[PDB]
Amino acid sequence: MRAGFYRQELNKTVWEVPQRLQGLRPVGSVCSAYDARLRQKVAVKKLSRPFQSLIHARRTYRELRLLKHLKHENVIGLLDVFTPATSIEDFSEVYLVTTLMGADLNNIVKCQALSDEHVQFLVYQLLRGLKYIHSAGIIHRDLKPSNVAVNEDCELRILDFGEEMGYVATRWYRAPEIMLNWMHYNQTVDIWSVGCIMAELLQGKALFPGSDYIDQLKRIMEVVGTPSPEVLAKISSEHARTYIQSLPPMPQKDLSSIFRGANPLAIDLLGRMLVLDSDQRVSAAEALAHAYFSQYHDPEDEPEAEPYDESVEAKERTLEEWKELTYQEVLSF
C-alpha cells in the first residue's frame, strides 16, 4: 500500500484508498464516498480479482478503456482510477471512481407512480445515452432498472454493475434472441430492454417478470404473439426452436389494451421496441425523433461517439502482458 493511502474492511473485504476518499459506505463491491480532491460525492468500485485469469484481465482493461472512452451526460462518467500498488510487482488491485447519482430506477418505481412527463424525460435520456453507446459500436447487453442511476431531478446515467437478496433479474429484460441462443444478435437487443424498462415506468411493475426461462418465454409470446416459422428461424438456435414450437400458438395482443390509460404516443413507441424481428425494432437514434419525446428532442444535442477500437484488447497476450498494459492505463489517468 502506497504512502497517503489508508486501509479499512468493508463487509469482510479490505479496501486500500487514498486520503482524498473519505466516508466509504457500501452501496453496494461498490461504495459511495466523498472525494476531497474533486469536492463531490463519488462511487468507488474495487474490481474483483482483476488478474485472476486472462478473461478477467481482458475485462479489467476493457472496463477501464471503455469508461475512459465514453464521455456523455447520460453514461456513467469515469472520474478517477487508482491502485494501492507501489510498483508492477505488487499490482493486483484496480479501483474505479465515477459519478454518484441519487438512486436507481427501481428505487424510483417503488417510491412513486411516475407522471407521463417524467417517463418521457427518463426514457429520452436512456435513449440518448444509448444512441451514443451504439454509435461507438458497443452493445450494453444488460440494460435493466438497477443499471440506470437517477438524481432527484430525473437526470439519468447508464451504468453496468456486471440472487436471493433488491435483486433485479437480467432475465426479465433480456431480448428473446439472446434467450434463444441466436449467435448473431446485435445492438437491437438493447432496444428490447429499453421497451421493457419504459413499460415498467409506465405501469409501476415489471412487464415480463418470468420466474424461469420457460415462464419468461411464455410471458413474452403472450404479449408479442408467437413468431412465424420464418421469423423463429432468425431469432434462435436449432435447439432453442423447440422451446417456442412446443408452446400453444398465441396471437399478438393490442398494446393499447395492456397499457390502458397510457399516452397513446407511449403505446405507439413501445410497439416499435417490443417486437421479435430485429429488422423491425426502432434504432435509439430514430426513437429520439418520436413524437413521445417532442418536449425534449434536440437533433444538435444528441451526439455520436468515436468508434471504440477493439484492436489492442483483442490481441493475444499473456497475463503478465495484460498487467503491464493495464498498469500503464491506471497510471496514465
Ligand X SMILES: Cc1cn(-c2cc(NC(=O)c3ccc(C)c(Nc4nccc(-c5cccnc5)n4)c3)cc(C(F)(F)F)c2)cn1
27 assigned to a ligand binding site: yes
> Applying CB under 6 A, does 160 fall inside the site for ligand X?
yes
Q: Which is nearer to ligand X, 27 or 169 (CB)?
A: 27
Bridge-based pairing of strands 40-46 and 30-35 is antiparallel
DSSP H helical ranges for 139-289: 176-179, 188-203, 213-224, 229-234, 241-245, 255-258, 264-270, 284-288
Region near ligand X per CB under 6 A, out of 156-164, 174-182, 252-260, 297-305: 156-164
The residue among 102 and 225 lying less far from ligand X, judged by its C-beta, is 102
Minimum gap (Å) between residue 96 Cβ and ligand X: 4
Q: Is 63 annotated as a binding-site member?
A: yes
| 189 marked ligand binding residue | no
Annotated ligand binding at 12? The verdict is no
Number of residues that bind ligand X (CB under 6 A): 26
Rg, Å, the chain Cα set: 21
Site for ligand X in 39-98 (CB under 6 A): 43-45, 59, 62-63, 66-67, 70, 75-76, 96, 98
Distance CA 133, CA 308 (A): 9
Nearest CB to ligand X, comparing residues 87 and 332: 332
Q: After which residues is the chain broken (C to N over 2.5 A)?
A: 28, 162, 165
Looking at residue 57, its amino acid is: A
Q: Are 81 and 97 in contact (CB under 8 A)?
A: yes
77 known ligand binder? no
Which residue in the set 34, 161, 296, 327 belongs to the binding site for ligand X (CB under 6 A)?
161
Based on the residue annotation, tell me whether 142 is a catalytic residue of this protein: yes
CA proximity to 176, closest of 189, 191, 158, 159: 189
Classify residue 126 as exposed, middle or buried by CB count within 10 Å of its CB (0-12, 13-18, 19+): buried
Question: Is 211 annotated as belonging to a binding site?
Answer: no
Query: Rounded distance, CA 150 to CA 321, Å?
Result: 38
| Nearest-angstrom CA–CA distance, 46 and 265 | 42
- Residue 27 C-beta: closest distance to ligand X, Å: 5
Contacts to ligand X from residues 16-35, by CB under 6 A: 27, 30
Rounded Cα distance between 40 and 100, Å, is 9
Q: Which of 80, 90, 116, 142 is catalytic?
A: 142
Q: Is 140 in the site for ligand X (CB under 6 A)?
A: yes
As annotated, the binding site includes 27-30, 45, 63
As annotated, the binding site for ATP includes 27-30, 45
As annotated, the binding site for nilotinib includes 63
Which are the catalytic amino acids?
A: 142
Name the residues that contact ligand X, by CB under 6 A: 27, 30, 43-45, 59, 62-63, 66-67, 70, 75-76, 96, 98, 100-101, 103-104, 133, 140, 149, 158-161
